[model samples]
Target chain A: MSWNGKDERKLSVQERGFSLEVDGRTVPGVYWSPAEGSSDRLVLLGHGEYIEQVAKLLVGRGISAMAIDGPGTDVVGLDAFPRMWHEGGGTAAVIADWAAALDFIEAEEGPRPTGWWGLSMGTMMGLPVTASDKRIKVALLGLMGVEGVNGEDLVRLAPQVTCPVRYLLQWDDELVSLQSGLELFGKLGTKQKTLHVNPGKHSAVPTWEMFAGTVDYLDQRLK
Target chain B: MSWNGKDERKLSVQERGFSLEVDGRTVPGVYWSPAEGSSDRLVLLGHGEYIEQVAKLLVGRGISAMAIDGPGTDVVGLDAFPRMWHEGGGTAAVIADWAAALDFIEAEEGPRPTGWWGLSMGTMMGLPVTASDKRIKVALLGLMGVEGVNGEDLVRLAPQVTCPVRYLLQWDDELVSLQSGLELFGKLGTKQKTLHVNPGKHSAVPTWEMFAGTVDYLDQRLK
Candidate 1:
């Protein structure tokens, strides 16, 4: 697939737009790129606690890293906490939309190597995306640890993935532990998996560095 | 003083207790290695945000890193947000308690060499703590652009620090920018400051194979 740059060239004339079609609620998002440059590999980032900042960094690097707003409740918009978890389970919608987004990005960017990055719940959604897509060759699952219900389910996704997985163990990660990642690793049958320990908390990833490495790694891996 | 155990025999266990006060309410803290044998030159850490999991990795290494509760009002307990900015004419108690904790850790360790390993907001606090205390010989301030108002001011304080400050700049730092750290670097009169630019977002100081390199650098600096 080729990025004729049609959607980009087409949208270049307009201002930035962000929206997620989770169950058709049109969840909002904020989108940008590092530069106007095009890539066969488009990285899709999901909003963790603060969605926009991490994704915006991707735009700074020219990686076409797109991030959506949180599960469905905008703190600034007065949606309140647990906004995305109740009733419709907006989280499920986001997971679906986020997963679906990979499809859309590939359709637009062509057969370039697609990547997924998500911290916390975003990582939860991204793992499945990595597992399902043969096109997605690499993933960085940040703020991950297994012990609870969400964590248990998240851990289960590892064996399903065929791509390279880097599990980041944050130094002051309160909710998860190094043991948790190790536990997840034990369950994984994949040979390409790695566990990374860093001096960061769970909220953020080793992002600025991750982007740089991702480009280089994908260049080689996706080659 | 002397770790030759010269004063070690003379120093009472209660003296170490007095040196490190664990009851700082502003910070949601957990104290470990209470026994001297369990402690090391390293301060067993619980970092901000990804509090639990990250700390586990460090503790596992016998490096004594913390897995702290990340930044937020709730982490300070049900207070929603600590009046971190409430005192100091507008500044909150959060920064002060954060400073106190570092001092407490250094005090408990009996002062060999000290450093900070933090991500995001914890990274933000790292600057002030490193600057204020001579004991903190090095710090890993990772995956943060230094924005959020205080970030610019925090980075600027680097000039007063006499010790080496090793910074991890993620190429994809979306929240803060080159301008953010540059704001501090521009004013840093210190010659020992080293900045490493790598592929990361708002992750942490180290990920991938990057962590060992950082730890080695810190070890060399402290030694």
Candidate 2:
């Protein structure tokens, strides 16, 4: 369950930073794939550094992964909320970019079983994409909330999801309340879904323990 | 375009309201299916009497439809908002109810193509259901909003949608601003999607006119 970045680097098929054109925007992203024919699954990641760390562990297991600094995020090299909540197409552009990432994967490795993984902001971004894109057959949504600027949207978004879902909740989160997390989980529309609760703060989820289960879920659903 | 209940009573396959257990709650819903063959498609109605009206038209066109009174809504004759926003599982329970409806459809008609249709609050409800339920391959979301309580969640919910979405926007909707509507459409994550803006107030959408188009989409994708 433990992931050492240096160790995984020594064990990866290939990893690199790549740019994709989505809705005409050149979006930057990190791409991780295991040795040729080593795996048959692709997982698109959402936000946070630990998320990237998890990506490395997945690649260590022969799962191809991609993570990007989505719109209004620091990694995208743009204003954090430039028209984020307004009537501009920034967020829409971000979703398109994610689709473009899928296009890149299909062009590179061809289609196989695929999955989506998101925590907090990543889930927020990934939910809409997963809802609209059928290519992702499985999804892991963790630490989701309803306390911030558009937090309640998770509830609205949850009902549109039809794929198998693994929803994780941090029991003692300092940022989002457990009630909010539970509510969000309840709102998911997938009939085949699971709820996982771990004892931790917002960022304190036991990653290795968590991804151990996450890996198993993705492997069964994707591979 | 035009739906009349009195006429449908005389000239239909089967129409009735049935009760199902969802998350242990007794949910009452209306079901309509063509007389000729159990459909290969199902349309879940959002909110409003017009949804039933649309259902009749779809059945006439060989599509099956169901309309239900979800949690916190009037069909069940209960308190829709007591625990609606403070968590506990009000919304999630509602999502479960929708899934249960699908369960009933599968039990009665066997499996088939499924789509979701919603306008305003119905669309609001549909967004989350569509996001969570991949069983739904197509969705018609119209007159959506970012106004009122839980309205902003639309932004958060938009990207999870991957189905072929036909988003209808009423140009002069007194309920939601056009800017907000455009923003919502922009946020949808489907690569194959379209926006149809009509000239009318919220309720004045030309249903028969729109149904002609809506049926075409459902037929191509579902049938």
Candidate 3:
């Protein structure tokens, strides 16, 4: 499937859509590549229109971006969600999908340097993915800890993450307090890490300008 | 399936085995009833050979008990577990199985009164099942407040629970601390609720001896 670019002319991005089955669930996704320039480097996004906007800018700068309909997102919808604790195979499964996405990009576009970008539920998935996959060289991670049932094991997973990280936090994220978010970032064992706190609600961020920071960080790390 | 009692003469409890299908998986279970007397009340147990010993004693004293292979149990096994947090249909599916057990008992022995007895993983399942199912008149809950992924919304379900409760706690439980367990207990909205504490590790409770309290509590609540 091919992506019909919404703002192809302005952004100079060519978009293509695709789908893959991960552990019995079909995941919907899209790939954004530069129309004018080509580069082997790629960025993995979890899911969001805003992130796609970031992807367009990334594509304009010779980097490709890919995102899937993450768990609880539009791809598989809400019906697949777990109703209780202990039934959480969701996080583990999505990570499998992320690896598969990486596999797809490597097989199709050839292996290039890779980076990660995620926020909220996206970060929850990206944390484990970055920890496990060597393909992910750098990460633009947002949100703090996961919101659901079990995470006594969450902090323990942080030490395994070795990539340079740029973590974003909202000073007054009502959903996840500043203290809780800071605690999650502190768990990261990454030797090269930076925290960027913006004032406002969880949904509000100085995002477009920050996208430049993401591009600069990935360029320095991946190039 | 029929259970050939292992130490029937000494225990004075009769057992019958059964199975049910939940989410395309087969769940093995057992029913323990008094060898000599009958009662109109029943309790549910999740895994653990030790809890069944408690069930045997409960049966001896005229209260029957039932147990099923809950998620992550040896019977259902880890292979059957969900691979992601939100992708977990685990809690909801298990509850459906619990209600099916109730339907089985109600259909076979006729509807009397129902109560729940569970520990750790068992209580995690029971809390949501009991909260939604009005058939359960009372509960013997312990071992955990809850488990896995996110649960910011789980405590909201506590208020819907109107049944009398006997909640047990181990003061020195390594997995769940006394304070954490108490905080979970504080969320219970049941007016007739009691907290029982003994000094020991998570596995230190005299499980079989504890059935007497379970039977007495059910007898009082279901009578």
Candidate 4:
């Protein structure tokens, strides 16, 4: 439950790449921080190809961000998603990994307001992670549904997520149906959650310029 | 059809209050223009107490805006929303008034890409207005539902709104049920429409700072 084999390397002026030992597994991760001083707000990004860009955006806004490799993806590789629903042990193992990441973050920066930004597979692990951890004060989640191998858990854990959430959904998502996505959105326990639906297939969310509202949501909540 | 007793007065350096003759009835309106030359983008404000503030915000972003008084409200008065559902002629009369306002705007500004921002009663009128008029390229609507005096008409006209839309729903809206709001949002026919839900009563939609995303949506589409 503690950081083992912890190694940190500076990725740039504002970012650091790190690895931690979580439950006997080497968890590779990256962290982005503001240039001046440590931020009191930290956002934990779920697994995604765009995590670095999103993390940099958060750092530019004076908030720190961190992300660990997803379940099957290695520390240095970008293949973060691995059909997690088909895996065993449910989402408990990944949930513990995220918890360990939080422990690492707290030790490094002291306690601060935290957020979670993950979609699709990110939401798959994030819903349970946010529900189990009170450290996360806000979250940006969506793009998955309640009808997969993890559907039952997502449905059960959704109501336990009390933090304010901003959920995104692709109306014509080929991977997840519109009905299932909407059902999950309805199950969220937070009274302060918002849903932003756009038209496209899965992974086709509008351009970052049009999708900046999600960043604004995080800025307002964490800062 | 045409402007009859059109009268204009300057409200400020950036805003003008005006009235127009529409369908033999005198209609009151306000127009906000950027301080520089002129903008080819125009937004029409629907019935609401904060239309002036929203208009001002749009104008600050260099997009022009115009607003005509809602049915049963006078030009000089702030009491814009009336129980139009209880009235007989449906939303037809108000729709005509908006069309007249558009005609006047086209005459003054020539052709332009236009957007609509309205909530609650604003959505009620805007749904039909956006559906009937192809000039409105985008819309920001919500805070009302599909079950009211105009419920049937709202349901019928929603699918006709082919323009991109951004809909808002208060999680605990007192005026409209959550189910009704979600149902109406589902009925929207646009390939590019989104719904933003927040936790609050009918009128307590967070602060302008938190709610600036709606402005961002308008800015991206209009400007």
Work out the TM-score per prediction.
Answer: 0.43, 0.45, 0.45, 0.78
lDDT of 1 at A113: 57
Off by more than 4 A, model 4: A1-18, A24-26, A32-41, A72-88, A108-112, A151-156, A209-211, B1-17, B32-41, B72-88, B108-113, B187-189, B209-211
Worst 10 residues of 2 chain A by lDDT: A1-10
lDDT of candidate 3 over A83-186, digit per residue (tens):
42124355677678888877876777889888998877677678888988988899888655544222444576778888888787765567667667666776
Show model 3 residue runs off by greater than 4 Å. Answer: A1-11, A73-88, A146-150, B1-223
Cα lDDT tens digits for candidate 3, B1-223:
2232234434577777777765676667788877765666787776527776778667766778888766552222233333532343556766787888777767766786778887776676777778889988888777575332223434666676678877777755776666666666667777566566554678776443266556666776775
lDDT, candidate 1, equals 0.50
Specify the CAPRI tier of model 4: medium
User: Which CAPRI category fits model 1?
Assistant: incorrect
Single-chain TM-score of chain A, each candidate: 0.70, 0.82, 0.85, 0.86
How many pairs in model 1 have backbone atoms within 3 A of each other, for residues 3 or more apart or on separate chains, i.e. clashes? 56
Highest DockQ among the candidates is held by which one?
A: 4
Give the docking tier of candidate 2: incorrect
Q: For candidate 1 chain B, which ten residues in a row score worst on lDDT?
A: B1-10
Residue-by-residue lDDT tens digits, candidate 1, A107-153: 54465556767656666566766666666667766565565224555
Q: Give each candidate's fraction of reference contacts reproduced.
A: 0.00, 0.00, 0.00, 0.77
Chain B TM, every candidate: 0.64, 0.82, 0.82, 0.86
Alpha-carbon local distance difference test for all models: 0.50, 0.68, 0.68, 0.76
Could you tell me the fnat of model 1?
Answer: 0.00
